[PDB]
Design a protein around this ligand. Structure first.
Ligand SMILES: Cc1cc2nc3c(=O)[nH]c(=O)[nH]c3[n+](CC(=O)[C@@H](O)[C@@H](O)COP(=O)(O)O)c2cc1N
Ligand SMILES: Cc1cc2nc3c(=O)[nH]c(=O)[nH]c3[n+](CC(=O)[C@@H](O)[C@@H](O)COP(=O)(O)O)c2cc1N
Ligand SMILES: Cc1cc2nc3c(=O)[nH]c(=O)[nH]c3[n+](CC(=O)[C@@H](O)[C@@H](O)COP(=O)(O)O)c2cc1N
Ligand SMILES: Cc1cc2nc3c(=O)[nH]c(=O)[nH]c3[n+](CC(=O)[C@@H](O)[C@@H](O)COP(=O)(O)O)c2cc1N
Lengths: 252, 252, 252, 252
């Protein structure tokens, strides 16, 4: 069967009560009625290393970045899930820092599958559940769904469901009675119905795009050097699409 | 046959040379090789009224807003196109004001159909071409594609292609030789292949979601009043998800 | 004698009731108690041409762009005001298209003050009023206030005041009783008090920065060509800060 | 003697070479030439706990969030610094998750200066250094500087300096020769000059705003309950500022 993986990216460790979890609790039985098996992971409960290392970095400095953690376990669940729902509180008009770490680490998956010539997360479907006290839902949805789009996820219409109160400091979903908020409840239902349909579609008729071939055709029509002259004689920062400075020619 | 409509939202009237049109000129033959009938509209060439009126406004003040313009023609083309590609320059880290006016008027389309019980632009596909001198493509992509998804568009992976120069004032795509810019050329090819595929899928197996039925289910599990107490005794704007202010008792 | 100019960027013509105008009506008497002269302009009531032309465009295509409108009148007012307050409704998680046009045209300035070597809007102060039915205030503040900062405006703390209802379709400020909304009313008071203080400060102690001399220091430490090699052999879009492609050597 | 604190929020531990540190290395001598004592902290080098606990959470599970870490050490520096410069690489069109955590924890302060009745970070100045491979500088600047403004920071004009390559995957500042990039080098000079000036101003003539008095005046003109009726009989998500549903009357 198809699988939906819902990542609660709250910053409070289980079992502390999460506002965002209220939206998850509505979505789970709806996915199960669709025949889509659900799993909820609260990512902050798990040891996921934030630090970065590759071979350009200092070798000893990277020991902590290279340590054994729980990321392979979580990455494998994401690879296996046909639907990825990020369920995030809003902080600083963004997703939480926990969602941010996960997405940073996930952005290793724009390289290739040997037989599809597609990124590893191609043919999957993304949805979004968000909870804020007042503001930021559409901004976060734009940022997060755009990034997932870059990785291979398809986004159906009305794929982001959320709760917000009025302009103010709070309170959140629980005291604000968001479990009976009509607009949120109808958005959650839209999102589940549409992500489920698109997931079944992509299971039957995946993209056949060969990104390697697209890239080769693009190589055969492009240069391998970008170069432009800069006007260094002005403090101005106003935009000029035509600057008439002269084109550049490259050494040998 | 499938139709793709590409809206160049440059602020300069034809035949003035448009940087963004360079990306369009790459995309059109690629769609035509996909078997998809393409049409390019430069919306600024057409008389589209920006002012708003509805029957809550003053009747005389709204006369200019109600005047006969070319919006019904353009709206009918959007309704007919299976793929909508917004092709916009970046201004102020946003789409152009012309794209903005078009999207404002298009967001009247969030009500139902017959028959399908879906918004009128359901089962369509969105992609994005963008051109800026230096910065803003992913921010604009998040904003524009999120809004199109609210209307019923589905978004495939890698649906946004763009050109940008380095940090600076420009110049633009033409002087910058973007027509031979590898990254842009490959993204344009990704976008055309993926949008064409998703359009063919949705032609054959559209969403069957009944938004009316989703809304009726939400109504049964929801209140028809939102009400919270407010802490009027503090200058603080720190978020507080629990405030223990007491419930609001509502009459009738 | 300081002047504050408040631009209501609603899309509905006077005298139609504007939701955003409710916040302006709170702010005006507060500024006047500060001893600051205030003027409110509803910009949609004035003829401001959106289209663009310069010498690189087609002459005949640009005739409409070059026509007589009310922009010189409005631009002179912005230039003269010590405090600019954009008072914008939210559309599509952005300011309105009317605000978008004004800012597009305001960004077309290409001057440097001969005596101070600064942009024309240096030493002015920016505040923000916003009104939306549910969502978008901090995103719009980020975008608009970042753009004004690039032009020369300084931004005090708590410079953006706004009203929003809960997640939903509305209603707006008037039916939602925003005029008695504590959070909005206290933010408006913070905004007026802080912008007023900062405006007075800059009137006594303006920036003495010499933008021309900064740019000349930068010219001495910088190249006049930007050039990089591009990896044209991969479909990957993964970010690689080091790519081992070789330096490009330019011939001048 | 003013203090400037520069937080490098790279995800790579010292002494691994950071692209963003290149911009920092330009700014530090410019600040010291202004007579400002400058400290650089690479926050990822320090053990700062990401998890959240307060007394509404689960005591037992909150033990890790409550643990002794290095946050008080870093917060003291932020409390003392007259200028805070966030120096962040761009990930996912945002600041890094490391910057995200720091700002999250900074936003948890709940204090009012007993004498000035201002938030604790009032009268400070914020600036920004950013480094990305291609895109996101103005979006990050909007988000980060809007958040610091809510905390009490003032933002001068041209307070955000950055480097970006063209559309693509990289490379970054070092291989792209950003240390000799004219646009970046001049923006760094603008930013140091303007933040230094504004910090000196605010040390002389701080804001005298009484936030508590402002909130008390807002309390007198406002309701202590927010309540609106909802239309539960539509699937539409079209925005409607006027819905004629009727007022909510609240008991007692
Ligand atoms: C540091 C910080 C920043 C915030 N930025 C925003 C914002 O910018 N906008 C908003 O509307 N709300 C914001 N909130 C409230 C919020 O979202 C959470 O409390 C709630 O949702 C809890 O969910 P959870 O119980 O599942 O963890 C923030 C709270 C923070 N601690
Ligand atoms: C007022 C204003 C603002 C801008 N804001 C940004 C921005 O924030 N970022 C960027 O990278 N570029 C920006 N540009 C350059 C740009 O985009 C166009 O010139 C080009 O693309 C034209 O394309 P076209 O020939 O098809 O019209 C702006 C230019 C403006 N006139
Ligand atoms: C097309 C369109 C899009 C919108 N996008 C958003 C959004 O993204 N978020 C929101 O919260 N609200 C939004 N609204 C409501 C809104 O803002 C205005 O009606 C109000 O403010 C009127 O103010 P006024 O009477 O002074 O003109 C939109 C309304 C639109 N017509
Ligand atoms: C996961 C991920 C995401 C990214 N998202 C973006 C983006 O959205 N836009 C951009 O322009 N660049 C991006 N980069 C490159 C970047 O910024 C850094 O490598 C550089 O700056 C290193 O700086 P440092 O050596 O001081 O750490 C990303 C890189 C990542 N590892």
């Amino acid at each position: 069967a198809l699988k939906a993986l819902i990542l609660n990216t709250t910053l409070r460790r289980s079992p502390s009560r999460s506002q965002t979890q209220g939206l998850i609790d509505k979505a789970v039985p709806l996915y199960e009625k669709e025949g889509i098996e659900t799993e909820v992971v609260r990512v902050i409960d798990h040891d996921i290393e934030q630090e970065y290392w590759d071979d350009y970095d200092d070798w000893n400095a990277g020991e902590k970045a290279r340590r054994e953690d729980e990321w392979p376990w979580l990455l494998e669940k994401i690879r296996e899930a046909d639907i990825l729902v990020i369920a995030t509180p809003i902080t600083l008009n963004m997703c939480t820092s926990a969602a941010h770490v996960i997405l940073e680490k996930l952005n290793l998956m724009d390289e290739l599958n040997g037989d599809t010539k597609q990124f590893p997360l191609y043919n999957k479907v993304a949805g979004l559940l968000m909870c804020g006290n007042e503001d930021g839902a559409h901004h976060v949805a734009g940022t997060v769904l755009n990034n997932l789009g870059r990785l291979g996820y398809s986004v159906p219409p009305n794929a982001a469901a959320y709760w917000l109160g009025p302009a103010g400091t709070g309170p959140g979903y629980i005291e604000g009675k968001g479990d009976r908020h009509f607009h949120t409840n109808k958005l959650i239902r839209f999102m589940v119905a549409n992500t489920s349909h698109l997931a079944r579609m992509l299971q039957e008729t995946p993209y056949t795009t060969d990104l390697e071939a697209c890239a080769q055709a693009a190589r055969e029509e492009s240069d391998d050097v970008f170069a432009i002259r800069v006007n260094v004689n002005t403090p101005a920062i106003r935009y000029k699409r035509f600057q008439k400075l002269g084109e550049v020619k490259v050494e040998e």
